[PDB]
Amino acid sequence: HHSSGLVPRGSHMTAIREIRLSEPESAQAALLALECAQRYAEPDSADFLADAAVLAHDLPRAVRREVERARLDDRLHALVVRGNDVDQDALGPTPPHWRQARTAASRRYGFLLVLYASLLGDVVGWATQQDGRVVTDVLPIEGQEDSQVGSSSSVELGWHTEDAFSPYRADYVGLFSLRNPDSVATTVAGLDPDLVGPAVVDVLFGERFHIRPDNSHSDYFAGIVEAVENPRAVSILRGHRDAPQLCVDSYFTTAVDGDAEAAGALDTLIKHLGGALYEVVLGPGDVAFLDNRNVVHGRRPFRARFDGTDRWLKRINVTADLRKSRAARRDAQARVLGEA
Amino acid sequence: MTAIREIRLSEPESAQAALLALECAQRYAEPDSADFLADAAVLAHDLPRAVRREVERARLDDRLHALVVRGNDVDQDALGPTPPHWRQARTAASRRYGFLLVLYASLLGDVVGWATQQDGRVVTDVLPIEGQEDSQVGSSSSVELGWHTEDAFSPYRADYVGLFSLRNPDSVATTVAGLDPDLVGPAVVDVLFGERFHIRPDNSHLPTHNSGGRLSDYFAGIVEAVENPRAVSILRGHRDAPQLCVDSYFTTAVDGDAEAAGALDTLIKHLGGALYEVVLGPGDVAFLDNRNVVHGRRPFRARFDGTDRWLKRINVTADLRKSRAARRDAQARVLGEA
Ligand SMILES: O=C(O)CCC(=O)C(=O)O
Ligand SMILES: O=C(O)CCC(=O)C(=O)O
Ligand SMILES: [Fe+3]
């Protein structure tokens, strides 16, 4: 049976918006994805992406109503849609590297992730991330266990706003779980301004910080070297005091040189978000969209087997405003930030 | 060549759009009722598929001038006379066209209004008013409405302006112009990219074009933008596809910037000449890409007998979230209530 509900975290009453698909809704979504996989080259080929926002309207109406409520909820942490069909037998083993992960068997899940994502905005990728793929792959890679990348395992992926340094950072990060046998969690935290000193909040609204590109990062790539060496003074909080946006990276954010008050406010915020971290576990066929304007995210330490049974998610970036990044894209329809 | 994208509705597609608009009119009070606007994006998806396909092509075309949907059903007899003032233009009979404008608009983005335009109505009215003939507002007639980016002064200016023509018996043209950067050359383009201009609010944001009972403080932001305009660019984004932000009556170069004043002078003559006509007949709805084109309206003689030209107008944003600092609360659509 279909159900939807609001799951609170701390004082965030609509932190998590959860939708459970009925079996007919799951079947309808799967049929649409399979039809797209029959009619279009790739989940992020130009032919499909030109049509993606119209085809997304063919998803179940009850689900579209709930996704639309999430899209306009400026206090959302995560929209979670549970109960999509994943045929584990037909999917086959978890690939050993993202370079081997754009498989024929998994295409239908890429298509479905783009269809859900296109209800929230327009899908984008990054030239420096998994060869500029829009639908990317999150799976453990042997040798990457202790790194601060999505392919890590043994070491906690430190929490951050996705692409925090960038004015073109996504509005949503989408995750479609294909398999997660050991129930490994995405970590999530938002700011509760009622748990932080108003003076600290005032400081975080100041353009008193440097957010440098993470290592996962030419007119465009000139700005990337400049962002490292001569970072612009930016705020961590922006917008309305009642609904501030958050932009911070637990490993790549500093106060401006000599701004001790700003250094203090930043470490107060880092301790607050560290303490407020909670978890979202996506079983097979569960999809989450994190509101990247409101939450930082990471991933818990876990034990990868590297035997083809490991955790595997499809991942996507979504923007509310594709047009605003045109200076960083190759042409009108191209979705790859930093391609030209 | 596809700067103007036209969809002519078949009778069935027109019928389907009308039935959806009437279903909305039966359910909700106003075409900008909060409950309707919450539901609008999903209801918009019930518009004809062929129409949604062409609107989506328009939405992602970053060189679009206007999407024009021709041949919506307008029952002229049932609509009754053109109101003599926008304040009186929220008529029972015209509600269905307000709802339909929002449904089309909600395929392109989220609808917004302004605290300082027609009392913060999201669906506004464009009709001639006695005493406004020679003004630079939408209710003018005798004097050409000078071309402009809608709300050029504001960082929260719309991505699309929607115009639903209810009535246009004398085929009065909307005017449109984009910038071809190649046709003006990289020298002027480089100047127009500089934060070297002042863009002040147009006269529609003044207390004289709102109800007298509206709070003085709604206008504080507008008056500040008139007295002390920020230094801003006219062009932004990619050199291959730059966005345009300029107003023929309210844009100046910053004091002492002779090179900027020259570049502005060149741009005005370029846009003024290329300025071309789109006639919206009854049932025609246009969405102007406000990032790409300035627009205006040709001069005409109003009859003031209830038969005059009448458009419904709406502002559309690609990104409602970005203006949250200027809105009362999450769902509120009226810019400048904060
Ligand atoms: O593995 C996860 O659950 C989250 C992935 C992630 O943090 C990321 O790639 O952005
Ligand atoms: O009357 C027209 O066609 C244009 C109206 C307009 O430019 C406006 O009201 O903003
Ligand atoms: Fe206008």
Author numbering:
A (entry chain B): -11 to 205, 216 to 338
B (entry chain A): 1 to 338
What does the paper behind this entry write?
CmnC is an α-ketoglutarate (α-KG)-dependent non-heme iron oxygenase involved in the formation of the l-capreomycidine (l-Cap) moiety in capreomycin (CMN) biosynthesis. The overall structure of CmnC shares similar folds with canonical non-heme iron oxygenases. The catalytic iron is bound by the 2-His-1-Glu facial triad comprised of His148, Glu150, and His295.
Structural superposition of CmnC, VioC, and OrfP revealed that three residues, Leu136/Leu156, Ser138/Ser158 and Asp249/Asp270 around the substrate binding site in CmnC/VioC are replaced by Gln142, Gly144 and Tyr257 in OrfP, respectively. To assess whether we could control the substrate stereoselectivity of CmnC, we performed site-directed mutagenesis and created a CmnCL136Q,S138G,D249Y triple mutant, of which the three residues around the substrate binding pocket were mutated as the same with that on OrfP. The residues involved in Fe and α-KG binding show no significant change between CmnC l−Arg,α-kg and CmnCtriple,α-kg. In contrast, the side chains of Gln136 and Tyr249 in the triple mutant CmnCL136Q,S138G,D249Y make close contact through π–electron interactions.
